[PDB]
Design a protein around this ligand. Sequence first.
Ligand SMILES: [Pr+3]
Ligand SMILES: [Pr+3]
Length: 279
Amino acid sequence: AAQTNAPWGLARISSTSPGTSTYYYDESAGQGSCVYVIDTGIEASHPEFEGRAQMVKTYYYSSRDGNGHGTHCAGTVGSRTYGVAKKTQLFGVKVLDDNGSGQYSTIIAGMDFVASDKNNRNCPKGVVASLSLGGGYSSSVNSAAARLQSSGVMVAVAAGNNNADARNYSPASEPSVCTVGASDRYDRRSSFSNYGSVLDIFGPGTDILSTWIGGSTRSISGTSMATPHVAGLAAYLMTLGKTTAASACRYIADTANKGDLSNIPFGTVNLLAYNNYQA
Ligand SMILES: [Pr+3]
Ligand SMILES: [Pr+3]
């Protein structure tokens, strides 16, 4: 399948080179997989989700995304126009408030929730969780991410926007998950992207167009935007049967574009998420 004039991030993930505009992908499009977006919520009513999104848990007064951040990330996972895996099922878990903030206790509860809740869903091709969030180092937050991964969920987490070593941020610094840095459309490390040995992979993160609340769209930047590219890619590859929740991050690194990125510090992987679609 081919989407013409795609957001640059989608085009990038289906090309060995920067600068292309068409997103090439297998028509299976992540069908049969499930992605939990653990964030500010998802505006499930957005036409771009086509009925494939639903809120399943909130830790606040409402399940509504009153911010937009979660809706943007969910859109990059699986919206029609802005999504990597355009036919996946999206599940919203609101651990962040409408200012985009959340307590670590709540974020941990949300991860534990997904580990259990997946056992009540039909997700024959597997389960992914996208965590576009984080703050300073916490062994408890890292452990929650490790548990979620161990439970059989492909966990993708943001590296953080501190232009620093991700070792000092959580859940980024949890080794057993998939820690995602951000790149821009000229294949530079995004100016804000964290780096370091714990990064597993980079995804498009600068000037990423996706869904927003109020049935709208906008372009924003962050390792928060790179993370759902990788979560969506994992879902897509799992639907194709090429990999599993336990092995998808490694598979994505195995098959990534290598050495294409600039301003990568020595000791940080130079690996950019790539779907290797061959029609
Ligand atoms: Pr290349
Ligand atoms: Pr890792």
